[PDB]
Design a protein around this ligand. Sequence first.
Ligand SMILES: *CCC(=O)N(C)c1cc(Oc2ccccc2OCCn2ccc(=O)[nH]c2=O)c(C)c2cc(C#N)ccc12
Lengths: 401, 547
Amino acid sequence: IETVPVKLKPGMDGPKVKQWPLTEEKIKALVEICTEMEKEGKISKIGPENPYNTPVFAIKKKDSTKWRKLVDFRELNKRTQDFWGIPHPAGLKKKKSVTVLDVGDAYFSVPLDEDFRKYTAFTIPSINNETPGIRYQYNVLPQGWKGSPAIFQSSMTKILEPFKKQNPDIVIYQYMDDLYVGSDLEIGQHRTKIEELRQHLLRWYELHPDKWTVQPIVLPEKDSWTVNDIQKLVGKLNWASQIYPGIKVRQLSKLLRGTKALTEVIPLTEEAELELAENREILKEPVHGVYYDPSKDLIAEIQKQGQGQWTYQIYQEPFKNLKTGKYARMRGAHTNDVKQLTEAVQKITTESIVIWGKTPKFKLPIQKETWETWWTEYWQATWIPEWEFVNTPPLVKLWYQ
Amino acid sequence: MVPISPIETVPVKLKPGMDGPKVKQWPLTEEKIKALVEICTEMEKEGKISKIGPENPYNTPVFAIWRKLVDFRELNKRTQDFWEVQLGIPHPAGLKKNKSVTVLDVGDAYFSVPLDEDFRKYTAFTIPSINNETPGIRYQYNVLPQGWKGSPAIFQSSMTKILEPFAAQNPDIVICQYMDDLYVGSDLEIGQHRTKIEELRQHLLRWGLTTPDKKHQKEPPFLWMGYELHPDKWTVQPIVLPEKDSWTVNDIQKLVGKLNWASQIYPGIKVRQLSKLLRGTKALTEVIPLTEEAELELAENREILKEPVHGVYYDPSKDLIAEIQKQGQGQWTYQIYQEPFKNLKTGKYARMRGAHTNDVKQLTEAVQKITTESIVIWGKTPKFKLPIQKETWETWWTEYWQATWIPEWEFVNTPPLVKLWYQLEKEPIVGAETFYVDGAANRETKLGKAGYVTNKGRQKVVPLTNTTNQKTELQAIYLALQDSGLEVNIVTDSQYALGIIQAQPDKSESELVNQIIEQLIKKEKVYLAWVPAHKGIGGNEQVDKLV
Ligand SMILES: *CCC(=O)N(C)c1cc(Oc2ccccc2OCCn2ccc(=O)[nH]c2=O)c(C)c2cc(C#N)ccc12
């Protein structure tokens, strides 16, 4: 009911980002949505004196046919002054189950600082560049802007005070327009509790982190090894020696002496079996000196393994993985690589939000033009992370398979 | 007098920390001064400008060419940024055919849009006095000045806000603003069309804006931005390729400009060989001879451009189809249409700068470009006709290490077809000879060696001059491919060669890579395995090639 002064970082002007082209159905959807919002005073038309711009598109969330308006506030978010903070709940990832709730509508009940409004300008584009586009700016806290959860944090505390006082065993975290509610109850009790919390918030996504663990490096167990098997094993052990210090390959490399056919079976000497067993024991231990630094970026790498399987690693320093995983879920994307990749990016970003409370920087195994052409077609999340593209095939792919 | 509705003014500011312009007025001749006095007296009588006192410290130079021309470049430098009047040029193929298209001249409205009063003081200008014996006449603008930075945007936005209700309550017409002209199209009967035109003239007159009753100068065919717009079709303005005995740099740049421009409706235009001559020149007057490839390409272009070709307008009730053909040397051509033999438009795509490439990647990129262009022009993705088999694409995207996707498409049998030229095995080949390869080079003398040893006792080492480590590794793989049967296993330690081959190129800048590609094409089965170097892996002989 009272506006809090907001400004940008010193020396930085507002965002000026080109609006990318949109299909006719997304444009019409945005026209309906924005007309309804203008009737409710959430946004207002602006004139040519506003030079700023932030891209906009439209999506369709899970289990819903209604179009939703998605604003790409990444540039404005990095250009907005830092708000202050609350330490991340390290127990949220340790909980048995977590549920994500979209609380974005609440942001629309708080007015936005007048002098800042011009920085939220966006454009509904026209087909074939016939007009300069329908230009709007926000009058209330917009969805996707980093200042919205910071400004609403007091009100959110006031609304969640009775529920948090009633259930001290339930962990509640907030990131952007999402509310993460973790507990240890049964799925039915968790769903009834989620309906209880949503009806509690009304009058004012099943996720199980306990079923997720870090993935160790495993080596094959065989009764007969070919030359090729031993060569691949030596390669993988040499790669792992960058992570684990005491890895030793010389006794296994001794078996490869001579020019033999790749398919020829080679029996393991006793020294080779002992070396392999020592390597197994070394790989069963965690990596030495692995810590998280909140001042550093999180880097997420993804490898396409084929047959709908994807691997990923989250780290800050090379060979110091903070998280590893394997997303093989198949959900209506059996024939589309890009949809699978987009869903994998969204899941990894969610896991990173739960663990560290921020989004990672992705390295995507895809050409820039393909990804930038198609990723908005399958995006369903409120937030958007940063990404770069790798054009050279990494050799370590099969070592994560 | 009928009351005139006021046009809402746009608040304008200067750039932060800056001040208004202060430029010294040039001395003018007596006749020019008299001319500017008459013109400015007329404009003051009309209300475009007003006289001001000595308190205004700002000034902008004025000229006469009479005609008054105020040079606002300094005030433009000091004026805030505005939203663009246009985010792009409309394309004729996106227009939807109309039974009637009428043109209205709203130029007189340009001078009826008021300027923000707090900003008017920055537009001050001074007419010099005769013999400079009296103080010059001081004026300031009350309306949007021609040449000021914000005039087109503020004018377009004002006109848009004016036209918004009229367009909203007449959804059976189309109104488009372009500069000081309005274009109204409709499929209504000509009488109802002219009627609604009169209604528009009245609605505009309610803001005091006057549209001329005189028969307009613009009429079919419309000549606009190098285009001809006809009632039922569109094309480019006539493209004439000049006959030159010798071609200079500007001749060839004009030729590639004409060919690029013509390629949007004339199918099959090629610019590769003619563009190859302008490489790293940076000399506008330099005269470059023509290669024979440039002559053949130019002849094909003259054959394509011999007679006029037209594109049709867009019909949203029909499907959108885009067909692609490979032309060779990284060139691709495409046609976008809704009916066979009647193109909406055409175009071309050239491969990006790269060391290695293959046809499938290029076809993919061209598909993405056509998709983006089509979403721009028509707001939807077209159905594609591609010269590639379904099984080829499925093998490719299922085995490719990168994620890739092409939208809905169908195979069209139009040679040359895009195909995969080799596929490496997933497992070692039983019964095939195993070649352990290696190569090495001296960094100073540039002397190297490349060779192999095999499980059957076959061996080879070749000495090389003017070489590097990477070249000797590739050369080693090449020697293994040369001297092996139709099925072969190959063991290397070169992460460089594996990085290249795993990218699956069918063409390269390096002749060595191309030779390896030819050898791979000739084989039946190839398994390529990698091992760490200097790890004592027998067979992998670093000492044999380091001698
Ligand atoms: C605002 C005008 C504009 O941006 N552009 C590119 C533009 C369009 C145009 O054509 C139309 C204008 C209004 C309604 C409909 C159309 O075209 C529909 C297709 N069509 C074209 C021409 C014709 O005779 N019939 C027809 O059905 C025109 C004509 C122009 C003209 C000029 C000029 N000079 C500049 C921009 C135009």
